[PDB]
């Protein structure tokens, strides 16, 4: 509530949101990041005979838009909380605290994590195989001690669409 009274703010409140919910975990924010696609529906690099334009729109075939997709890392050291961030545990805590309380439709948030090696099994049935997108924690049958690694990704906190359609009426002639 003290943080949610300043308008249009901030980045440093996301540090408080993590240290509240599970101690031992720290947070760092990178403000801009190299986001990618949105694929533009006309390719627009046809070189035109009747009418064309220059001033801003210059590109190839896929665009890059930095502007709003921040990166967040977490860092734990108690293994009971390592199995809390994989989907099912504390991931439902952040995923609802962001989307309707603190940010809403401001931005989109990328998540990331760095632990020591993993605690992750393999190809068992219907639902809990995937450690996000990657898999590990199964092959080191060689050496005793630690190596540090990044963990995985989590999904963005986004909400969007187009609905379908074309229109039929208009505003007003003033």
């Amino acid at each position: 509530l003290p943080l949610m009274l300043l308008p249009g703010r901030t980045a440093e409140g996301l540090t408080s949101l993590v240290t509240l919910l599970a101690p031992g975990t720290q947070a760092r924010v990178w403000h801009h990041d190299r986001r990618r696609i949105p694929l533009k529906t006309p390719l627009t690099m046809r070189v035109h005979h009747p009418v064309s334009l220059k001033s801003r729109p210059v590109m190839g075939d896929h665009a890059t838009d930095v502007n709003g997709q921040v990166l967040l890392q977490l860092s734990t050291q108690t293994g009971s909380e390592v199995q809390g961030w994989l989907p099912g545990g504390h991931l439902y805590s952040d995923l609802l605290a962001l989307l309707h309380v603190y940010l809403g439709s401001r931005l989109d948030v990328r998540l990331q994590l760095c632990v020591e090696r993993s605690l992750l099994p393999d190809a068992r049935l219907s639902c809990r195989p995937a450690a996000g997108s990657p898999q590990l924690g199964r092959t080191a049958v060689m050496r005793t001690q630690a190596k540090i690694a990044t963990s995985a990704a989590r999904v963005m906190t986004i909400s969007l669409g187009r609905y379908q359609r074309v229109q039929e009426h208009y505003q007003r002639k003033e």
């Binding site: 529906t41 092959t139 080191a140 187009r162």
Partner: protein, 127 residues
């Protein structure tokens, strides 16, 4: 369209590229054995139709076995669905009609035809 092929060694994060690229490389080996004394603008094995709705402006295909000249196979009893019905409503003269089974062309930056968005060029698709 380069065809990469990865290493599996001593604990490697399972990425979606590492299975698609391996799916590609053994398609390409099938054609290189298949050239070896053949011609390859390749074609059609089986094609069986429906003649019932020809008094109307409808026409639908019932079974198709086609091998395209890029080496991709269509085996409509196994892992591919029958296409929608064609339309004859915009025809003035009836000798013109030459029906040709289409399929969109793959690029190196696109992928599945996600419904929910429009485009001027179609793609193959998760169904």
């Amino acid at each position: 369209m380069k065809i990469y092929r990865p290493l599996w060694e001593d604990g490697a994060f399972l990425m979606p590229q590492q299975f698609q690229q391996q799916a590609a490389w053994d398609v390409h080996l099938a054609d290189s054995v298949a050239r070896m004394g053949l011609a390859h603008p390749w074609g059609v094995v089986a094609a069986e139709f429906d003649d019932s709705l020809l008094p109307l402006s409808r026409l639908n295909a019932t079974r198709l076995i086609v091998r395209f000249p890029d080496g991709t196979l269509i085996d409509t009893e196994r892992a591919d669905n029958l296409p929608p019905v064609c339309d004859l409503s915009t025809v003035s003269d009836r000798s013109l009609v030459d029906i040709v089974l289409a399929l969109p062309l793959l690029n190196a930056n696109g992928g599945n035809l996600d419904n929910g968005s429009e485009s001027e060029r179609p793609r193959r698709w998760k169904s």
